[PDB]
């Protein structure tokens with residue numbers, strides 16, 4: 001007769017029930033005032049930012065009319081308002097923030113994980129591991145689809161995987177932007193163009209003109225995944241190094257050693273990126289030249305030759321901008 | 331010389347700066363203990379649920395050995411443990427919850443909007459309006475692609491829109507599940523199958539056998555969007571009615587009038603759904619019959635004929651289940 005155990009467990013879980021429901025009640029109260037605090041802080045910050053920017057506008061428009069001797073105080077005045085802006089960014093980094101017009105077309109609730117600092121730093125790492133693992137899958141299946149097979153089922157499967165990976169990746173990093181980062185919005189239009197390119201390659205009716213481009217496209221995709229493979233290593237190394245510099249617990253790792261390490265890494269890495277840039281430019285060129293041949297007539301060739309050229313222009317300019325800015329930073 | 335205004339605005343915004351940073355500090359503190367409370371509550375609830383289910387298991391296995399006269403107390407004992415489970419569901423409805431293995435493959439942070447009740451009820455409405463608006467776009471462009479055009483560019487564009495809409499929609503409702511709902515997981519595998527179907531239709535190389543199926547597929551897509559058009563009306567009406575019943579402020583709207591209205595609406599709606607079910611079954615049949623013709627040889631025909639049949643079986647069974655359960659509920 002084990003019922004006795006069950007019944008006295010019933011009432012002891014019952015006493016637990018009330019002592020836990022009291023906690024639940026006070027929790028609800030706490031949540032209420034915390035919400036009020038959040039609303040108050042956000043409204044106040046918005047008002048202050050507006051006031052600051054407008055007064056800075058007024059001072060800037062009045063500045064040329066004024067001589068430099070009294071303008072001394074003025075230049076350190078903007079030199080301090082900019083850091084006031086920086087601290088405003090710091091403070092806004094926690095308060096829940098509105099969605100940025102692309103998430104709001106897929107979602108509509110609020111996801112600002114960075115209510116802590118560990119809770120954010122341990123999201124970017126997960127993102128990096130996602131990029132690496134998917135690159136493994138793509139390089140493997142690209143090898144299979146280029147050296148040993150010639151069908152169109154497998155080719156369509158590879159292109160579908162590509163067009164899914166790019167879209168989930170643009171969602172992750174469009175969250176990672178409003179949490180906080182400097183992600184240089186070209187790096188997202190890059191995904192949109194690459195998605196359009198794969199999509200067009202998906203409805204290419206074969207014949208005697210597909211087989212002339214399949215080889216180059218597959219090989220280039222292989223190489224690009226390899227570059228992502230190396231870039232993982234450098235990026236993750238940089239992230240851990242920078243945390244270990246910000247966290248002084250391990251040892252007083254000076255900024256000098258970090259900078260030397262990062263500079264050596266980047267300067268070693270850069271030739272491969274430039275090789276890839278020129279590889280796709282040559283790719284676009286051969287595609288146009290092929291299109292000029294009067295033997296083909298398919299609208300897919302020019303529409304698959306423009307994204308390559310656009311994509312090269314953007315990538316080349318942005319890489320040079322980053323290296324040049326880093327060089328002046330020194 | 332407007333500098334004076336600017337400088338005294340500087341120091342008055344400065345006094346504002348400290349009086350706001352104090353608020354920020356206390357806000358951070360509050361957030362800290364609120365996090366501790368959340369963790370404590372979730373751990374406690376997990377332990378209690380495990381204990382309750384295991385003791386219920388023990389009682390159930392011991393029950394057949396025991397006679398009914400003493401089992402009286404036993405049946406109201408399970409009749410009360412089930413409501414204890416219900417209240418546990420209520421309480422867990424607020425605490426942040428882990429992601430369900432599909433979001434965690436696209437995301438990895440936590441989005442439980444239902445920290446309130448308005449903040450959730452005003453998400454489902456947005457979801458409904460999204461479904462309606464996208465149905466408008468699809469019905470319009472389907473009309474254009476069937477009566478007046480015959481190309482393949484426009485057809486591919488329509489199929490791409492379909493395969494994007496289904497995927498964003500499965501993301502929205504897979505959030506809406508873990509917030510809280512009874513969404514009958516067949517209704518999501520439905521989206522996966524429909525996505526696979528459109529994908530296969532996307533790489534169909536035309537010829538003398540595509541033109542025999544294009545008409546039926548487009549017309550069926552039109553009709554299906556029309557059913558979504560009506561289902562919006564009924565669903566939104568039901569949601570507002572149920573809120574107006576739960577909210578007794580307007581008037582003591584009895585459950586009887588609500589039930590009569592909902593029953594009339596559903597009984598009026600059902601014939602169209604059944605028509606659609608049989609429409610797609612006939613569609614799968616004609617597709618197989620066409621495949622039997624020795625004049626075609628394309629692997630796309632059987633792979634486009636199975637999802638139709640599978641999809642019909644699932645839809646028919648699930649609709650009958652819902653109507654039967656609702657009938658016993660009365």
Ligand SMILES: CC(C)(COP(=O)(O)OP(=O)(O)OC[C@H]1O[C@@H](n2cnc3c(N)ncnc32)[C@H](O)[C@@H]1OP(=O)(O)O)[C@@H](O)C(=O)NCCC(=O)NCCS
Nearest residue numbers: 181182183184187224227231238266273276277315319322
């Ligand atoms: C830019 C590059 C030198 C990296 O340098 P970097 O670490 O970004 O240097 P910065 O200090 O400017 O970093 C700026 C921000 O860009 C972010 N970033 C996000 N996505 C990125 C991406 N795809 N590439 C580069 N930077 C990226 C970094 O995270 C960093 O922000 P955070 O560190 O604060 O989170 C290198 O990644 C690059 O050139 N990108 C190549 C892109 C590519 O795939 N090309 C392939 C051609 S075949």
Ligand SMILES: CC(C)(COP(=O)(O)OP(=O)(O)OC[C@H]1O[C@@H](n2cnc3c(N)ncnc32)[C@H](O)[C@@H]1OP(=O)(O)O)[C@@H](O)C(=O)NCCC(=O)NCCS
Nearest residue numbers: 511512513514517554557561568596603606607645649652
């Ligand atoms: C099922 C149906 C009668 C709706 O009834 P219902 O309101 O779901 O009745 P229930 O009380 O069982 O509702 C159960 C839950 O299912 C949810 N639900 C979510 N997505 C749904 C969907 N696509 N269809 C039906 N119910 C859905 C409802 O929101 C409800 O949960 P909630 O009200 O607590 O949020 C009706 O929508 C249906 O038969 N679906 C047809 C699906 C379809 O598109 N078929 C096309 C064939 S051509």
